[PDB]
Coordinates of C-alpha atoms and ligand atoms in Angstrom, one line a residue:
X1 CA 13.9 23.3 -8.8
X2 CA 11.6 20.6 -10.1
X3 CA 10.4 21.1 -13.7
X4 CA 7.9 18.1 -13.3
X5 CA 7.0 17.8 -9.6
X6 CA 6.3 21.5 -9.4
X7 CA 3.3 21.0 -11.8
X8 CA 1.8 18.1 -9.8
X9 CA -0.8 18.0 -6.9
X10 CA 1.7 17.2 -4.2
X11 CA 3.1 19.2 -1.2
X12 CA 6.0 21.2 -2.5
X13 CA 8.2 21.7 0.5
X14 CA 8.8 20.3 4.0
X15 CA 7.5 23.5 5.3
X16 CA 4.2 23.1 3.3
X17 CA 4.0 19.6 4.9
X18 CA 4.7 20.9 8.4
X19 CA 1.6 23.0 8.1
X20 CA -0.9 20.3 7.0
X21 CA -3.5 19.6 9.7
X22 CA -6.2 17.4 7.9
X23 CA -6.1 14.6 5.3
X24 CA -7.8 15.3 2.0
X25 CA -7.2 15.9 -1.7
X26 CA -4.9 18.7 -3.1
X27 CA -6.6 19.1 -6.6
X28 CA -9.8 20.4 -7.9
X29 CA -12.4 17.8 -7.9
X30 CA -12.5 16.3 -11.4
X31 CA -14.6 13.8 -13.2
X32 CA -13.7 10.9 -15.4
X33 CA -15.3 12.8 -18.4
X34 CA -12.7 15.6 -18.0
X35 CA -9.8 13.1 -18.6
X36 CA -8.3 12.6 -22.0
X37 CA -9.6 9.5 -23.8
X38 CA -6.3 9.0 -25.7
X39 CA -2.9 8.1 -24.4
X40 CA -0.5 10.9 -23.6
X41 CA 1.6 11.9 -26.7
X42 CA 5.1 10.4 -27.0
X43 CA 7.6 10.7 -29.8
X44 CA 7.0 8.8 -33.0
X45 CA 9.9 6.4 -32.5
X46 CA 8.2 5.0 -29.2
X47 CA 4.9 3.3 -28.6
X48 CA 2.8 2.5 -25.5
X49 CA 2.6 -1.2 -24.7
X50 CA 0.4 -2.9 -22.1
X51 CA 2.1 -6.1 -21.2
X52 CA 0.0 -9.0 -19.9
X53 CA 1.4 -9.7 -16.5
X54 CA -0.2 -13.1 -16.4
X55 CA 1.6 -14.1 -19.7
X56 CA 5.0 -15.7 -19.1
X57 CA 6.7 -14.0 -22.1
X58 CA 5.5 -10.5 -21.2
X59 CA 6.5 -11.1 -17.5
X60 CA 9.9 -12.2 -18.8
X61 CA 10.4 -9.0 -20.9
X62 CA 9.6 -6.8 -17.8
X63 CA 11.8 -9.1 -15.7
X64 CA 14.8 -8.4 -17.9
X65 CA 14.3 -4.8 -18.0
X66 CA 14.2 -4.6 -14.2
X67 CA 17.0 -7.0 -13.7
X68 CA 19.3 -4.8 -15.8
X69 CA 18.0 -1.3 -15.0
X70 CA 16.0 -1.2 -11.7
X71 CA 17.0 0.2 -8.2
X72 CA 20.6 0.1 -7.2
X73 CA 21.9 1.0 -3.7
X74 CA 23.8 4.3 -3.4
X75 CA 27.2 2.6 -3.9
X76 CA 26.0 0.4 -6.7
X77 CA 27.0 -2.8 -4.9
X78 CA 23.5 -4.3 -5.4
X79 CA 20.6 -4.1 -7.8
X80 CA 17.2 -5.7 -7.1
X81 CA 16.5 -8.8 -9.2
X82 CA 12.8 -9.4 -8.7
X83 CA 11.8 -12.8 -10.0
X84 CA 9.3 -13.5 -12.7
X85 CA 7.1 -15.3 -10.2
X86 CA 7.4 -12.3 -7.8
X87 CA 6.4 -9.9 -10.6
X88 CA 3.2 -11.9 -11.4
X89 CA 2.3 -12.0 -7.7
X90 CA 3.0 -8.3 -7.0
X91 CA 1.2 -7.0 -10.1
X92 CA -1.8 -9.2 -10.3
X93 CA -3.7 -9.1 -7.0
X94 CA -7.4 -9.7 -6.9
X95 CA -9.3 -7.1 -9.0
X96 CA -6.0 -5.8 -10.6
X97 CA -6.4 -3.5 -13.6
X98 CA -4.4 -4.7 -16.6
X99 CA -4.5 -1.2 -18.1
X100 CA -2.4 0.0 -15.1
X101 CA 0.7 -1.9 -16.2
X102 CA 2.3 0.6 -18.6
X103 CA 5.4 0.2 -20.8
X104 CA 7.2 1.9 -23.6
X105 CA 8.9 0.2 -26.4
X106 CA 10.8 1.3 -29.4
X107 CA 8.5 1.2 -32.3
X108 CA 11.0 0.0 -34.9
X109 CA 12.2 -3.2 -33.2
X110 CA 10.0 -3.5 -30.1
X111 CA 13.0 -3.0 -27.6
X112 CA 11.4 -2.5 -24.2
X113 CA 12.6 0.9 -22.7
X114 CA 10.5 1.8 -19.7
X115 CA 7.9 0.5 -17.3
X116 CA 5.6 1.6 -14.4
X117 CA 2.8 -0.3 -12.7
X118 CA -0.2 0.5 -10.5
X119 CA -2.2 -1.9 -8.5
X120 CA -5.4 -1.3 -6.5
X121 CA -5.1 -1.0 -2.7
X122 CA -7.7 -0.1 -0.2
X123 CA -6.1 2.2 2.3
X124 CA -7.0 4.0 5.5
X125 CA -5.5 7.4 5.0
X126 CA -7.6 9.7 7.2
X127 CA -6.2 12.3 9.5
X128 CA -3.7 10.8 11.9
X129 CA -4.4 10.3 15.6
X130 CA -2.2 13.1 16.8
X131 CA -3.8 15.6 14.4
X132 CA -7.3 14.4 15.4
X133 CA -6.5 15.3 19.1
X134 CA -5.6 18.8 17.9
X135 CA -8.7 19.1 15.8
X136 CA -10.9 18.0 18.7
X137 CA -9.3 20.7 21.0
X138 CA -10.1 23.3 18.3
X139 CA -13.6 22.2 17.6
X140 CA -12.7 20.9 14.1
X141 CA -13.3 17.1 14.7
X142 CA -15.7 16.8 11.7
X143 CA -13.4 18.3 9.2
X144 CA -10.6 16.0 10.6
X145 CA -12.7 12.8 10.2
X146 CA -14.2 13.5 6.7
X147 CA -11.9 11.1 4.9
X148 CA -11.6 8.4 7.5
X149 CA -13.3 5.7 5.5
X150 CA -10.9 3.3 3.7
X151 CA -10.3 4.5 0.1
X152 CA -9.8 2.5 -3.1
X153 CA -6.7 4.1 -4.5
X154 CA -3.6 3.1 -6.7
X155 CA -0.2 1.8 -5.4
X156 CA 2.5 2.7 -7.9
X157 CA 5.7 0.6 -8.1
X158 CA 8.4 -0.6 -10.5
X159 CA 9.0 2.7 -12.3
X160 CA 12.0 2.0 -14.5
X161 CA 13.7 3.6 -17.5
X162 CA 16.4 1.8 -19.3
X163 CA 20.0 3.1 -18.5
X164 CA 20.5 4.1 -22.2
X165 CA 17.5 6.6 -21.9
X166 CA 18.2 8.2 -18.5
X167 CA 17.8 11.9 -17.9
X168 CA 15.8 12.5 -21.1
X169 CA 12.5 13.3 -19.3
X170 CA 11.0 9.9 -20.0
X171 CA 9.9 9.3 -16.4
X172 CA 7.6 12.3 -16.3
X173 CA 5.8 11.0 -19.5
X174 CA 5.4 7.6 -17.8
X175 CA 4.0 9.1 -14.7
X176 CA 1.5 11.4 -16.6
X177 CA 0.3 8.4 -18.6
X178 CA -0.1 6.3 -15.5
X179 CA -2.0 9.1 -13.8
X180 CA -4.4 9.4 -16.8
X181 CA -5.1 5.6 -16.9
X182 CA -5.8 5.6 -13.1
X183 CA -8.0 8.8 -13.3
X184 CA -10.0 7.2 -16.2
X185 CA -11.0 4.5 -13.6
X186 CA -12.3 7.3 -11.2
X187 CA -9.3 7.0 -8.9
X188 CA -7.6 10.3 -7.9
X189 CA -5.0 9.3 -5.2
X190 CA -2.0 7.1 -5.3
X191 CA 0.5 5.9 -2.7
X192 CA 4.1 5.3 -3.6
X193 CA 7.5 4.8 -2.0
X194 CA 11.0 5.6 -3.1
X195 CA 14.5 5.6 -1.7
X196 CA 15.0 9.1 -3.0
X197 CA 13.8 12.3 -1.6
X198 CA 11.1 13.9 -3.8
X199 CA 8.4 16.5 -3.0
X200 CA 7.3 15.6 -0.3
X201 CA 7.1 12.5 1.9
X202 CA 4.6 12.1 4.7
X203 CA 6.9 9.5 6.5
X204 CA 10.4 8.2 6.1
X205 CA 12.2 5.2 7.7
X206 CA 15.6 3.6 7.7
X207 CA 16.3 0.2 6.4
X208 CA 17.6 -2.4 8.8
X209 CA 19.2 -5.7 8.1
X210 CA 20.1 -8.9 9.9
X211 CA 22.9 -11.2 8.6
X212 CA 21.9 -14.8 8.3
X213 CA 25.1 -16.0 6.4
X214 CA 28.0 -13.9 7.6
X215 CA 30.7 -15.9 5.6
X216 CA 28.9 -14.7 2.3
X217 CA 28.1 -11.1 3.4
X218 CA 31.7 -10.3 4.4
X219 CA 33.0 -11.6 1.1
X220 CA 30.6 -9.2 -0.6
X221 CA 30.7 -6.0 1.5
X222 CA 34.5 -5.7 1.5
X223 CA 37.7 -7.8 2.0
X224 CA 39.0 -8.2 5.6
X225 CA 37.0 -6.6 8.3
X226 CA 34.4 -5.1 9.4
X227 CA 35.7 -2.3 11.6
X228 CA 34.6 -3.2 15.1
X229 CA 35.6 -6.8 14.6
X230 CA 39.1 -5.8 13.4
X231 CA 40.9 -7.0 16.6
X232 CA 41.1 -10.6 17.6
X233 CA 41.7 -13.2 15.9
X234 CA 39.4 -14.7 15.0
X235 CA 37.0 -11.9 13.8
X236 CA 35.2 -14.4 11.5
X237 CA 34.6 -16.8 14.3
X238 CA 33.3 -13.9 16.5
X239 CA 31.0 -12.8 13.6
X240 CA 29.6 -16.3 12.9
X241 CA 29.0 -16.7 16.6
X242 CA 27.2 -13.3 16.8
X243 CA 24.7 -14.1 14.0
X244 CA 24.2 -17.8 14.7
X245 CA 20.6 -19.1 14.9
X246 CA 18.8 -22.2 16.1
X247 CA 18.3 -24.8 13.3
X248 CA 14.6 -25.4 14.2
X249 CA 11.8 -23.0 15.2
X250 CA 11.2 -22.6 18.9
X251 CA 7.5 -22.0 19.0
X252 CA 5.5 -25.1 19.3
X253 CA 2.4 -24.5 17.2
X254 CA 4.4 -23.1 14.2
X255 CA 3.5 -24.4 10.8
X256 CA 3.0 -23.0 7.2
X257 CA -0.2 -21.1 6.6
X258 CA -3.0 -23.0 4.7
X259 CA -6.1 -21.6 3.0
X260 CA -8.4 -22.5 5.9
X261 CA -6.4 -20.0 8.1
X262 CA -7.4 -17.1 5.9
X263 CA -10.4 -15.9 8.0
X264 CA -8.4 -15.9 11.3
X265 CA -5.3 -14.3 9.8
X266 CA -7.5 -11.6 8.3
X267 CA -9.1 -11.0 11.7
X268 CA -5.8 -10.8 13.7
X269 CA -4.0 -8.8 11.0
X270 CA -6.8 -6.3 10.6
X271 CA -7.1 -5.8 14.5
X272 CA -3.4 -5.1 14.7
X273 CA -3.1 -2.9 11.6
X274 CA -6.0 -0.8 12.9
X275 CA -3.6 0.7 15.5
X276 CA -1.6 2.5 12.7
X277 CA -2.5 5.8 11.1
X278 CA -1.9 4.7 7.5
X279 CA -2.6 1.1 6.6
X280 CA -4.2 -1.3 4.2
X281 CA -7.5 -3.1 4.5
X282 CA -7.5 -6.6 3.0
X283 CA -10.5 -8.7 2.0
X284 CA -10.3 -12.4 2.4
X285 CA -9.2 -12.7 -1.3
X286 CA -6.4 -10.2 -0.7
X287 CA -5.3 -12.0 2.4
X288 CA -5.2 -15.2 0.4
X289 CA -3.3 -13.6 -2.4
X290 CA -0.7 -11.7 -0.4
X291 CA -0.2 -14.2 2.4
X292 CA -0.6 -17.8 1.2
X293 CA 2.8 -19.3 0.6
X294 CA 4.1 -19.3 -3.0
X295 CA 7.3 -21.1 -3.8
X296 CA 10.2 -18.7 -4.1
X297 CA 8.1 -15.7 -3.5
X298 CA 6.2 -15.5 -0.2
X299 CA 6.5 -17.5 3.0
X300 CA 3.9 -17.4 5.7
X301 CA 3.8 -19.2 9.1
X302 CA 1.1 -19.2 11.8
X303 CA 1.3 -20.2 15.5
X304 CA -1.7 -22.4 16.1
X305 CA -2.7 -23.0 19.7
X306 CA -5.8 -25.2 20.2
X307 CA -6.8 -25.1 16.5
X308 CA -6.8 -21.3 16.7
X309 CA -4.3 -19.0 14.9
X310 CA -3.0 -16.7 17.5
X311 CA 0.1 -15.3 15.7
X312 CA 1.6 -15.2 12.2
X313 CA 4.5 -13.8 10.3
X314 CA 5.2 -13.5 6.6
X315 CA 8.3 -12.6 4.6
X316 CA 8.9 -12.3 0.9
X317 CA 12.0 -12.9 -1.3
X318 CA 13.9 -10.4 -3.4
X319 CA 17.2 -11.5 -4.7
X320 CA 19.7 -8.8 -5.6
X321 CA 22.4 -9.0 -8.2
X322 CA 25.8 -8.4 -6.6
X323 CA 27.2 -5.9 -9.1
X324 CA 30.9 -5.8 -8.2
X325 CA 31.9 -9.1 -6.8
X326 CA 32.7 -12.5 -8.5
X327 CA 32.5 -15.5 -6.2
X328 CA 28.8 -14.6 -5.8
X329 CA 26.3 -13.4 -8.4
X330 CA 23.3 -13.1 -6.1
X331 CA 22.2 -12.1 -2.7
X332 CA 19.1 -14.0 -1.4
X333 CA 17.2 -11.5 0.8
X334 CA 14.2 -12.1 2.9
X335 CA 12.0 -9.0 3.6
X336 CA 9.8 -8.8 6.6
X337 CA 6.1 -8.6 5.4
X338 CA 3.1 -8.5 7.6
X339 CA 2.7 -10.1 11.0
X340 CA 0.6 -10.1 14.2
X341 CA 1.4 -11.4 17.7
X342 CA -1.4 -11.9 20.3
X343 CA 0.1 -14.7 22.5
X344 CA 3.9 -14.1 22.4
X345 CA 6.3 -11.2 22.4
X346 CA 7.0 -9.9 18.9
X347 CA 10.8 -10.7 19.3
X348 CA 9.9 -14.3 19.9
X349 CA 7.8 -14.4 16.8
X350 CA 10.4 -12.7 14.6
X351 CA 13.1 -15.0 15.9
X352 CA 11.2 -17.8 14.3
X353 CA 11.1 -15.7 11.1
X354 CA 14.9 -15.6 11.2
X355 CA 15.2 -19.3 11.8
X356 CA 13.0 -20.3 8.9
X357 CA 14.6 -17.9 6.6
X358 CA 18.0 -19.1 7.5
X359 CA 16.9 -22.7 7.1
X360 CA 15.6 -21.9 3.6
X361 CA 18.9 -20.5 2.4
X362 CA 18.4 -16.8 2.8
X363 CA 21.5 -14.6 3.3
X364 CA 20.0 -11.7 5.1
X365 CA 16.7 -10.4 6.4
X366 CA 15.8 -6.9 5.6
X367 CA 13.0 -4.5 6.8
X368 CA 12.0 -0.9 7.1
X369 CA 11.3 0.5 10.5
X370 CA 7.5 0.6 9.9
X371 CA 4.9 -1.3 11.9
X372 CA 6.5 -2.4 15.3
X373 CA 9.7 -3.4 13.5
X374 CA 11.8 -1.2 15.9
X375 CA 10.7 -3.3 18.9
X376 CA 12.9 -6.2 17.9
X377 CA 15.9 -4.5 16.2
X378 CA 18.2 -4.6 19.2
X379 CA 17.6 -8.0 20.6
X380 CA 17.5 -9.8 17.2
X381 CA 20.7 -8.0 16.0
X382 CA 19.4 -5.9 13.2
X383 CA 21.6 -3.0 12.2
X384 CA 20.7 0.1 10.2
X385 CA 21.6 0.2 6.5
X386 CA 22.3 3.2 4.4
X387 CA 18.9 3.1 2.7
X388 CA 15.7 5.0 3.6
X389 CA 12.2 4.4 2.4
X390 CA 10.2 7.5 1.9
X391 CA 6.4 7.3 1.7
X392 CA 4.4 9.7 -0.6
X393 CA 0.9 10.3 -1.6
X394 CA -0.3 11.7 -5.0
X395 CA -3.1 14.2 -4.6
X396 CA -3.5 13.8 -0.9
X397 CA -2.5 16.4 1.7
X398 CA -1.2 14.4 4.8
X399 CA 0.4 15.6 8.1
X400 CA 3.9 14.3 8.7
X401 CA 3.8 11.0 10.8
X402 CA 6.4 8.7 12.3
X403 CA 7.3 5.6 10.4
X404 CA 6.0 3.5 13.4
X405 CA 2.5 4.9 12.4
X406 CA 2.8 3.3 8.9
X407 CA 1.4 -0.2 8.3
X408 CA 1.7 -0.5 4.5
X409 CA 4.4 -2.8 3.3
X410 CA 5.4 -1.9 -0.3
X411 CA 7.0 -4.7 -2.2
Ligands
MYA501 C1 -4.0 9.1 -9.3 C2 -2.9 8.3 -9.9 C3 -1.5 8.9 -9.7 C4 -0.4 7.9 -10.3 C5 1.0 8.5 -10.4 C6 1.5 8.9 -9.0 C7 3.0 9.3 -9.1 C8 3.9 8.1 -8.9 C9 5.4 8.6 -9.0 C10 6.3 7.5 -9.3 C11 6.6 6.7 -8.1 C12 7.6 5.6 -8.5 C13 7.9 4.7 -7.3 C14 9.1 3.8 -7.6 O1 9.0 2.9 -8.4 S1 10.6 4.2 -6.8 C15 11.8 3.4 -7.8 C16 12.3 4.2 -9.0 N1 13.1 3.4 -9.9 C17 14.4 3.4 -10.0 O2 15.1 4.0 -9.2 C18 15.1 2.5 -11.1 C19 16.4 3.0 -11.6 N2 16.2 4.4 -12.0 C20 15.4 4.7 -13.1 O3 14.9 3.9 -13.8 C21 15.3 6.2 -13.3 O4 16.4 7.0 -12.9 C22 13.9 6.9 -13.1 C23 12.8 6.3 -13.8 C24 13.6 6.7 -11.6 C25 14.0 8.4 -13.4 O5 14.3 8.5 -14.7 P1 15.5 9.5 -15.2 O6 16.6 9.5 -14.2 O7 15.8 9.1 -16.6 O8 14.9 11.0 -15.1 P2 14.0 11.7 -16.2 O9 14.8 12.8 -16.9 O10 13.2 10.7 -17.0 O11 13.0 12.4 -15.2 C26 13.5 13.3 -14.2 C27 12.4 13.6 -13.3 O12 11.9 12.4 -12.6 C28 11.9 12.7 -11.2 N3 12.3 11.4 -10.5 C29 13.5 10.8 -10.3 N4 13.3 9.6 -9.6 C30 12.0 9.5 -9.3 C31 11.2 8.5 -8.6 N5 11.8 7.4 -8.1 N6 9.9 8.7 -8.6 C32 9.3 9.8 -9.1 N7 10.0 10.8 -9.7 C33 11.3 10.6 -9.9 C34 13.0 13.7 -10.9 O13 12.8 14.3 -9.6 C35 12.7 14.6 -12.1 O14 11.6 15.4 -12.0 P3 11.8 17.0 -11.6 O15 12.6 17.0 -10.3 O16 12.5 17.5 -12.7 O17 10.4 17.6 -11.2
F65_502 C1 18.9 -2.1 -4.4 O1 19.5 -2.3 -3.1 C2 19.7 -3.7 -2.7 O2 19.4 -4.5 -3.6 C3 20.2 -4.0 -1.3 C4 20.8 -5.2 -1.1 C5 21.4 -5.4 0.2 C6 21.4 -4.4 1.2 N1 21.9 -4.7 2.5 C7 22.9 -3.7 3.1 C8 23.8 -4.3 4.2 C9 24.6 -5.6 3.7 C10 24.1 -6.4 2.6 C11 22.7 -6.9 2.9 C12 21.6 -5.9 3.2 C13 20.7 -3.2 0.9 N2 20.8 -2.3 1.9 S1 20.0 -1.1 2.4 O3 20.5 -0.2 3.4 O4 19.1 -2.1 2.9 C14 19.1 -0.5 1.2 C15 17.8 -1.1 0.9 C16 17.1 -0.7 -0.2 C17 17.6 0.4 -1.0 C18 16.8 0.9 -2.2 C19 15.9 2.1 -1.9 C20 14.5 1.7 -1.7 C21 13.9 1.4 -3.1 C22 12.4 1.3 -3.0 C23 12.1 0.0 -2.3 C24 10.6 -0.3 -2.3 N3 9.9 -0.1 -3.6 C25 8.5 -0.5 -3.6 C26 10.2 1.1 -4.3 C27 11.8 1.4 -4.3 C28 18.8 1.0 -0.7 C29 19.5 0.5 0.3 C30 20.2 -3.0 -0.4

């Protein structure tokens, strides 16, 4: 049972979700005027705090909270360690709403205890292609297309409650206060991802990873293995050889993205993302914010042929604290972000991703099987991890879709 999620406008079972045939809201239409003006009540020892995510000291406070208390893998080998610079980038895109960055502190000594953040995203979230075919057969095309226009909604991330305050029902209070602040802006849907199963995802995909620095990963994952390399020797030689990469990119035309590339990147990205059921719509300002390179945060390269951008790829950096080990405190991971190929096979493009990442000192490249990420898993030697990413809407009925129909990369 679900004392909190059972009270919310989300599909309550897989079975409920199996039945959904059209996109659209779950709740009663409401108006901003219906929504409480004052913050949701919390106990007298706590206070609401709106950190300024553009202010270095407030960023630092959130940073420490997440560093010590945010997402761990199932075996508690790793905990994300998002950088300060990354936090500022992720939480302050163009037209961001400072009121959507919500924290709780202890009133008496200002100890930071909890956080959640929303940012605006414009998303296509109309009825998916396969359900529209069904609707057309049945003479229900108009009902299936009602919510096809891109919608200005909230993307929620970075929900975190300090370890000392877990399982005290603080997360539901954070979620209700975030909901209220978003609703007060006349927004009624949100999109969110999690590695846990909650009621009820519209899509779910595995994580995949690709070793860039085998010597370091084997030190971390266990002692003297892994299983299928057991017999040789040398298993370490075999492993290094398996994951080895060119030291320079192969694609002539490859260079870092520059601001003048923004219009062309937007055009090729938007044409590609259009082929997916759920996916963002980015303005030029959003393309510039999410894709222009930023030291230690986001890395974006374009293939230019004849002064025209024909392909591009991006990845972003999330270090993880290595919780158990000693030789190594941190794992430097690259995550596949957006890309688009029009002149070369996607595997040839992503190979250059791997080369640049390796060249820049990343230990591993990680991704979810969204977009066309499955198309290069085998040849580029990605292996499935133990993680899954589950995609959810708040207040939006949505038919189940494959993760290959999802084009929103959540940081
Ligand atoms: C229109 C605008 C809408 C905006 C809001 C839309 C909703 C956004 C939703 C948030 C999207 C966030 C996206 C991300 O950032 S996903 C990443 C979440 N963060 C972490 O995993 C960090 C480490 N863990 C923690 O900090 C905590 O354990 C959290 C905070 C996760 C739970 O704290 P705690 O362990 O101390 O528990 P509690 O007693 O306070 O509360 C227990 C209740 O919380 C439900 N629970 C557990 N995990 C999650 C989860 N990941 N999303 C939603 N709900 C979750 C659980 O089913 C139970 O409810 P019910 O089963 O009893 O019913
Ligand atoms: C916290 O976990 C780590 O820091 C982490 C670090 C390293 C990982 N590997 C596993 C294989 C060898 C070592 C390198 C790559 C994984 N693996 S795994 O299979 O890829 C996974 C990835 C991610 C998770 C977390 C669940 C997703 C959390 C959401 C992520 C997106 N938001 C926007 C919301 C939370 C769990 C396992 C994990």
